[PDB]
Amino acid sequence: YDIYSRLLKDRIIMLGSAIDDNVANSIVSQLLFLAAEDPEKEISLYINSPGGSITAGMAIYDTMQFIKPKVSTICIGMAASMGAFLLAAGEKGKRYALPNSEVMIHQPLGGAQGEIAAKRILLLRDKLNKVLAERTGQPLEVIERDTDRDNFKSAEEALEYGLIDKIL
Amino acid sequence: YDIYSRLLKDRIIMLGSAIDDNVANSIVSQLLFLAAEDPEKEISLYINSPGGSITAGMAIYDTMQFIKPKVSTICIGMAASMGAFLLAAGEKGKRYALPNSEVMIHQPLGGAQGEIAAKRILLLRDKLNKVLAERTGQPLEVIERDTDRDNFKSAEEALEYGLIDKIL
């Protein structure tokens, strides 16, 4: 009877570590699980992560968009690259953050398979620059110069993009 | 049925080890947990720690200021450079210490992400020098010369700053 287990009860998940295929499978399962108990109860997802890879991040995003309930997101502390692309992929009015939290946007590290798949990596990281552009409200040609550089943005200034829309 | 678990019961937490992201998540959860049982019961937090890092320390402080109950703090033994701050962030009249305990104030070690984020580290460690100045009662220009040097201060002399206000 662990503490995280009790947080799985009443509909919370804690992505806290990192992302790879080992944790991806274990999160996809919990999402599908909690959907089965009730089809309208708001599930949530807390984030505090230092990174993530490309192939697994685009498994949780799809599952998030399929289950009939609606997901909410919060940023506890760090919001590395990629794992924080999930934060901008919840609901249109239920994205939060604490007022000392850092979030950055940057294209992730590593490859797809995790020889080198060139034509496919280059396509995958074009989708990110296009999905992020429909959830914030910006043009595309500005995201293409903020998904190539590195600088942490605070919580009060992240609001002007659209990654977050209410700071508690 | 462990002994710490029984101390989680009747509202105590034991930060005793160190601070990093692994323990941060596990403390934020317990804080949110105990709030759910009762919204007015005084929770406490015992400290005995040799250090801590910057990004995670400013996650517990925010959570501490959000839950409607009020937190109390005690210094068992050592009070490192980052732990100390949490001790000076409880209530205005419920900060204690034992009469052999040492506490020091010093800006922490390491970086933010845990390349190097220069513009952000330098901003974060300005907040510390400003929050500590509203909880003790001193000017700012004295804290800026005590958050740059290293010397342990005893429990009887720490009182004259405001980190502690009643010694048992």
Partner: peptide, 6 residues
């Protein structure tokens, strides 16, 4: 973190 997420 309620009121209001939950």
């Amino acid at each position: 973190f309620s009121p209001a997420a939950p």
